[model samples]
Target: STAERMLSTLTENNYTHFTGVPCSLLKGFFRLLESKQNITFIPSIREDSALGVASGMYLGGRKCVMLMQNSGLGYCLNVLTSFNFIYDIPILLLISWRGEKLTDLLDSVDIPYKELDYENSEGTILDALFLIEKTNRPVAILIK
Candidate 1:
């Protein structure tokens, strides 16, 4: 339901492009995105490249969304803050919440880090938020 809601919101907002690095946690969403012809999925080699492509898509008059794992956020921080933030760029971010605890158990063995300290430490979401706030751009947090 959450995923559908997110997709609907984007579609309603006139976002027609998507690009990002793949995360195991977000595979289902990626598959869903594939059915939307207006949404172009561009697989990126690196997180920064994903951000760059999203930026270019925005400049081309397209609203874009970037999906990645929490860990991959670190890789794209520089570009997000320096380029996206400074230039007032906005895009929806769908991040996988791997290290957080939940009631239902899911297979997370594929995630490189099994013991992420999301509760006690300043995790990727918070760090990304800080950078986002600094640049005055909007960022939404979605946890799986």
Candidate 2:
């Protein structure tokens, strides 16, 4: 239902191109999208490149979607904020949910190491939303 809803929203909004690196969670939607002739899907080597490609697609008068894992989001934050955000570009993001509950488990005792922190709260989404909002561009989130 979530995927279908997102697909409808995207098509209704004139988002006809999708580009990004692959993530397991997004594979199904990606596959389903292959049936459309107008929609172009470009595989990126990295998340940063994916963002760059999406930006280029926007400049070419096409709406774009970028799919990647959540950890990859951290890798591309700089580009997202500096390039896309500063330039007022709108691109849809499909981020896979991962590393959501590391805090609840016991810390490892084998080695003296820093504990792994989980980013499973509204704070994560809020922070991301704030950054995107600061650029005056619209962004939507989909969780599964």
Best by TM-score: 1
What TM-score fits each model? 0.68, 0.66
lDDT of 1 by residue, 1-144 (tens): 546555664565466688887666887778787764366789898788988898889889887778877777768766666776668886656656654432112122111122324342224334444555464563645464
lDDT of 2 by residue, 51-76 (tens): 88888988898777787766676567
Best model number under lDDT: 1
Candidate 1 lDDT at 112 equals 17
Worst lDDT window (10 residues) for model 2?
104-113
Candidate 1, position 144, lDDT: 48
Instruction: Write down the TM-score for model 2.
Output: 0.66
Residue 80, model 2, lDDT: 62
lDDT of each: 0.62, 0.60
What value does the lDDT take at residue 89 in candidate 1?
82
Q: Which stretches of candidate 2 lie over 4 Å from their true place?
A: 35-37, 99-135
